[PDB]
Amino acid sequence: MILKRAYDVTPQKISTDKVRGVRKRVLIGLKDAPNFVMRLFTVEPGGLIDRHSHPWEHEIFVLKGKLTVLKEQGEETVEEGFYIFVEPNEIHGFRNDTDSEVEFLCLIPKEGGE
């Protein structure tokens, strides 16, 4: 059994053509997980995960702040305490329009890698 403070997992900075101002922690990865993986994303102020889709679902829980969720069309802001279920293949992305860090848990099936 593994019991650990998520913050103590070293975050990975992501900065690409589609993702900016985002850090990813892999809490429960491929090494441990038989079926699905647990990540914690931190979105800096003005950070963005542009619209994309995958063959797998997402299960998300918003831990901190106000998260702007990009949808196939339009967007929706949610707060800490919301969960999000993204169906396979659904276009989605995220933005932080606030002045403080936003955090959310994101779990995917293992085929999605970590």
Kindly list the residues in this chain that would bind its own copies in the complex (CB under 8 A). Answer: 1-7, 27-28, 32-36, 38, 56-57, 59, 61, 63, 69, 71, 76, 78-79, 81-90, 92, 105, 107, 109
- Can you tell me the distance from the alpha carbon of 36 to that of 96, in angstroms, rounded to the nearest whole number? 26
CB-based contacts of 114: which residues, under 8 Å, 6+ apart? 26, 29, 30, 37, 39
- What is the closest distance, in whole angstroms, from the C-beta atom of residue 91 to its own copies in the complex? 9
Three-state DSSP at 34 gives coil
79 annotated as ligand-binding: no
72 annotated as ligand-binding: no
Nearer to its own copies, 15 or 111 (CB): 111
